[PDB]
Structures are given as C-alpha cells and as structure tokens.
Amino acid sequence: RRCPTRPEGQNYTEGIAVVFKENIAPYKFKATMYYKDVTVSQVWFGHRYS
C-alpha cells in the first residue's frame, strides 16, 4: 500500500512581540492642597470649671 507521509509542517515565522493588556491602574500625579482650618469654640466658664 501507499504508506502515509508526514504533514507539511507548520511554517513558523520568527518575530518580536509586545503584549498589551487593558489598563486598570489609575493615572496618578502629585497635587498640592491649600486650605485653612477655621475652628471657633464656644466655652461656658462656670464657678470652678470650663
């Protein structure tokens, strides 16, 4: 009988790859916060205590 043969064999193309995935990391940066704590306190001064 006609004996079978090997397949053609995969034609492989060498190359260089960069694999990107979806970005979930938030964009970060440095900010500066200027503000003023305004604290007003009402005190009642007693005979011995405040």
State which of residues 37, 44, 47, 49 lies at the interface with other proteins (CB under 8 A).
37
Q: Could you tell me if 35 and 41 are in contact, meaning their C-beta atoms sit under 8 angstroms apart? A: no
State which of residues 18, 25, 38, 43 lies at the interface with other proteins (CB under 8 A).
25
Backbone phi, psi, residue 13, to 5°: -110, 110
Question: Shortest Cβ distance from residue 2 to other proteins (Å)?
Answer: 36
Q: Could you tell me if 44 and 50 are in contact, meaning their C-beta atoms sit under 8 angstroms apart? A: yes
DSSP class of residue 25 equals S
Asked if 1 is part of the footprint of other proteins (rule: CB under 8 A), the reply reads no
Binding site for other proteins (CB under 8 A): 21, 24-26, 37
